[PDB]
Amino acid sequence: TDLLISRMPFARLVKEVTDQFTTESEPLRWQSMAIMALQEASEAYLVGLLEHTNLLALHAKRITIMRKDMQLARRIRG
């Protein structure tokens, strides 16, 4: 279990979003295991995307990832 974004900001963001989409008035709590599950998944997700983006830079003989690469990555992934 080794996260790259710090637990504190990631949790803040998770509350903000959940506060907007929940049907309840009192703030919804999260088991601490649930937020870590979510974070690991979210990080794994951005790494997957970052590495596809990287592959599209190399394809174009750059080592610097560019917005357009990440956008083409999102097109090909579906």
Partner: protein, 80 residues
């Protein structure tokens, strides 16, 4: 408010180097910020729906699992 601003530059670089990125054009950070916001909006929307259907007040790991695996969202690619 704008807690998406709290997702830090070093963090993104740290995510990038883990994905093998040698260097990063400046416009990638905001872009990475949008993708995550978009992403944790589908998932958290779904997780919260499971917690309420189960008439519960805590989001559980089974809610997160179920939210993540739910159709109508790309996780990796064409497969899902």
């Amino acid at each position: 408010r704008d807690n998406i601003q709290g997702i830090t530059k070093p963090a993104i670089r740290r995510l990038a180097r883990r994905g093998g990125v040698k260097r990063i054009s400046g416009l990638i950070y905001e872009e990475v910020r949008n993708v995550l916001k978009t992403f944790l909006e589908s998932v958290i929307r779904d997780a919260v729906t499971y917690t309420e259907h189960a008439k519960r007040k805590t989001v559980t790991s089974l809610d997160v699992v179920y939210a993540l695996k739910r159709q109508g969202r790309t996780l990796y690619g064409f497969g899902g």
